[model samples]
Target: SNTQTVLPFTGLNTPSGVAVDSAGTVWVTDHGNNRVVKLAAGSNTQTVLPFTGLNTPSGVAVDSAGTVWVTDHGNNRVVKLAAGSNTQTVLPFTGLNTPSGVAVDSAGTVWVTDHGNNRVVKLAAGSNTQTVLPFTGLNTPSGVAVDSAGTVWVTDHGNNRVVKLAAGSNTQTVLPFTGLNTPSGVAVDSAGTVWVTDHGNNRVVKLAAGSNTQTVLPFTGLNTPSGVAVDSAGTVWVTDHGNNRVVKLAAG
Candidate 1:
């Protein structure tokens, strides 16, 4: 039997999205509480951030320099709190209808899943880029991750599929996962492997790069987990939302 360290920590209320920063700090969007928080490298205690006007903060991502980007779903906006800023700045793209998930790549380009709009947006160099039909037909794209090579991975919740937009061609490919129920969160590792939160299925699945096999993580009774992120060290983190807690699964 593989003994996995499923550390289920408490104190959060319906955390929806999660991301690990460069320093190993785990940031989470406290969805139910309409707040954002972070857990230190080796501590379970949470530190609530000082951002204001967070209406149902649904997704969170930490950039290279520790800047926090979030999807303010209820507010219908995406915002960013820099390394040491207490207040958040509204991003360039406006009129976002229920944005759900966010991700940043090595080049500092931002990708967001606009759930209400049923499209994925790319923000680069402080400008907005429109996604095409192959990527925009995504009904309720909830989670998004841009790989180092610029390939975009997304979890299409309403469509119950995990899809990817090719970097250069913008071609769409649906993963070969049978019975994926309301997939919610997605994260891609350095090696192109993808992690998806199969919310309705109450499990997390891993799709290795260049392979058709899907590995459902050995977690029982997951209870509709929401967000997922892979830190630089390859450690996996997921927001066990329905349980009002977070789970950390070590890479080793």
Candidate 2:
């Protein structure tokens, strides 16, 4: 059965990344609108936070403190929006050239993919210091996600593959998988399986933990799907950029 729900785009424009918080709220990055929007857990009502200084926001994530982090592409910095007040502050860091994807680990560490620089960096939870984890095979890294074990998964859009970086180390393991067409966004479920959106193919695929095989999920009719996320219940949510909508697929 092709079961799904098309989320309403009330104030959405060029929606890029879709993230589900601990409370199940959906926080989306509206690239065209230059802001992030929050969609209530069980309703279509949206709270559009058009914060000042936001420019071409690309990716969004919520940390353990419930503070929202956004990748302000045009501004070349990642901004943190206070959970409740929506007050925005640029994350204290340097060397971010076209940061595109943002993700927070269970330990509160922030990970961002520097698309223009062809590398990823990690921000310590409290110190706010950055450690650039450079790798040789990365090509225009975009979406990033950290799993339960703290390992980072990245979508290499330009290279047409996904790579995993061991926690706290520069060791890189390129998933021995293929057939990805312009991989864009990535997420890890509670079960450790990785879900990635293939923008060029208009489909989302799954890679079982510690395996090389790939399983393409039942997501059809997507147009330029850019961002992908997994909620607490394991359901998959994707941002359909070309169609100007978000689609929620039941847990696979």
Candidate 3:
């Protein structure tokens, strides 16, 4: 990977979550402005998604069909949109309660974190109805991620812990309680290691797939990391909210 000094690429309104599509285009959830932003990899071209209908967009995911799923936090709903045009609200008010984080499974099921309800909702692809894993004893689930096997991992902000919901199972498991503190965002690597952004502690912790072991990240530097994402190349990208910048880490 070509390395460079951290640069402020563009100004965003309280960006809550960010994802890079298969084509390397960057998409950010502009929470403060209630919209999503798309930026070309090496160019300045930009596009905003569904500005009129979004009420504080927080998290995002892209499916195989190139459709976008976003968590409308303020509106307490989750919406889907086409790849090219970001102005249409495809799935609106899909039985979500204060949805905060989102991810798309291999089967195209749209999973969203319902913050206020402390649950994760799974909806059929392109449908507004939810199916399973709701209100299952979670406390303030803030961020979520899906693994290769479709296991849903969520960070419970109120409980200071991470949870894993196996595919087709309503029961959940809490993991690696050793180093987490107000966990905000989570991303899984190719090796199944789960990386979580600990907001209160100002660090990132990686939980080995099937164990409680954890590795603290950037022990020498970090500032209130809130959102995290891992690319296909295994590099880690973090949203340093307190520092007002996005930090990139070399592959481990």
Candidate 4:
């Protein structure tokens, strides 16, 4: 069995989303606290960022420019926190009802899952405008991530499956995988494999790139795990929301 290292941090009130920046700093959204925090890698030091106009933030992602994007679930908007500053701005996207999950691609475009609207939106870089994808066959999409090749992968919680949106064309292709129970947070590893948190099943699953098979990784001791991320070393980190803890597991 691989050892699990529990991160020590204070003031975590129902934390949800997690992302590692280029410098290895771990950013988390404390949903209950209504603020996002940063944990320095290899150090116990934590910084509670100053954010305004946030309401029950759920998902978070850091872009290549070091900007932090947060899904303000309670506010029905997405907030962008400029890197290394307290300054924040709410993305001017209409119809972003109950935005839940957020991710940034290599091209710096921001992707968000509109949980309340059952659609996903893309915010192009350097533009305040947003274009909503024709999310056919999607239901209650939650966690979202973009792969190196630019395809969008999203966990359709209500549909009990993960779907990939073809880059550019925006065509939908439900991955040939199954056995997911209320999948929540999602991420794509460096190798382009898809990782999803089976919240209702109390485990995490991995789908190798270019394969139809699904691998149920050993999350032998998790309870309602939600958000998931892959670090530089390929370690899979999960937020044990039910147990009030965060866990790290060796790559499968």
Candidate 5:
């Protein structure tokens, strides 16, 4: 089992999104501050991307190439950050309404949840191209994650359900969400365990892969939990939105 550690940060204003890259650096999107801050593993010097053009950045993800993807809530678009240059692409499309969450798969494809538009968007790797999900009937989706199987798991926030959509398929089904309350974030472990952060319920819930039965881990000190991720050691990292901090659950 791995031990837990809560980084010593005094204050963070609306720390909405977080991503751990291949290099172990944590990239955080401070929403209220309207910028992205990078925290390297061994250093206390915070590298802040002072792109004022970024308005209320909500969700972030890092690709294998070290390029970072971020969804801006106020701007209603997505941006990509590369290694050598700070220039950002404004993502020309505009059908999205209040984009909130984002995730990148092994192939570098970007998936974004449209909160206001009530759907999801997919952008191909290294291309200006994009695609929208549930072109018809999606309801207020929030967070998203792509599994090893290329399938996508989305948190239908408005629907109080977590849905699994087959890769490149229009088919979808609501998963074991009997105890979920406004599920805000989701992540799939290497063992295929799906962990969901139930915001309205203030806890993280777990469901076995391919099974509908659920086992709640019973997190006790969270306040409006939003996003969750699992590290290489299988330790669960949860973003407590209301608490404005990140916490790790001991892997056992």
Candidate 6:
């Protein structure tokens, strides 16, 4: 039914991004508070993580191994929070300029959007060196997501569009979407549906696999849908900063 449920997280402090794990737990980057917040599958108060020294964290992702990755925006670096431990450290990448978003592929490769650099970079699994991607001329890009096929998706906010970087190829395709103003966050479900948060428009959009047309979701409290993520069960979780709540779309 495309029905949605809203869970309000008091004192969210401008959640900028959201990521859902297989356990249905949602991790949010509390931008205003300089920390990350955790919420269980059901209704529960936000649980503050020991994300010490985070400065305006913007994006978050949970990989297959439960390791959490966040873009420490103010710190100008990506942070790897080891799973099941309070131990976290800055990813060895240097020269990063206001890193914004992060996505971990199936092989554990970490991709990040360097907002101030207008470029995307990646670190191979088990490697400390990060390489700049072939993508170029990105203007303040924000959201990033890697699909099951290893295809990389990004919201080119400066271009007001989205891009598809085919797996293992240099070919990039700009997704067809008009009127996309400040696309902030992106996520791909297991079924290959790409979901994006159109921040300026205060709406959510999706493109089904192999479909050229995109669907705009008419959600009630998405006044400023800032971040998005999907779990194995196909439920969509979006962070609505405008309403200070996490909107979950599930089959009733």
Candidate 5 positional error at 147, Å: 2.2
Per-residue lDDT of candidate 2, residues 134-198 (tens digit): 56768889899987787888999999998888766767878765788888999987777888998
lDDT of each: 0.81, 0.84, 0.74, 0.81, 0.77, 0.83
| lDDT against true structure, model 5 | 0.77
Between candidates 3 and 6, the one scoring higher on TM-score is 6
Backbone atom clashes (below 3 Å) for every candidate: 0, 0, 1, 0, 0, 0
RMSD versus native structure for model 4: 1.7
lDDT of 1 at 252: 46
Give a tens-digit lDDT track for model 3, residues 1-252: 444134344566567787766666667776766767776667666677654678778788876567888888888877777767646565643556777799886678777888887777777756656765743667888898987688888888888888887777766787755766788899886577888888899887777767757777653356777688877776677767665556677655
Cα lDDT of model 6 by residue, 1-252, tens digit: 468887656687778999887777788998988989888668577787777789999899887677889999999988887777887887888799888899987688899999899988889888878888777668999989997787888899989999878877787788877789999988887677778899999988878777767777757657877899877565777888887777888622
Task: Return the TM-score for each candidate structure.
Answer: 0.92, 0.94, 0.87, 0.93, 0.90, 0.93
RMSD of each: 2.1, 1.7, 2.7, 1.7, 2.2, 1.7
Candidate 1 structure, TM-score to reference: 0.92
Candidate 5, residue 131: the lDDT equals: 79
lDDT of 2: 0.84
Off by over 4 Å in 1: 1-10, 128-136
User: Where is model 3 more than 4 Å wrong at Cα?
Assistant: 1-8, 44-46, 90-95, 210-212, 219-221
Model 2 Cα shift for residue 130 (angstroms):
1.1
Write down the TM-score for model 5.
Answer: 0.90
Which window of ten consecutive residues has the lowest lDDT sum in model 1? 1-10
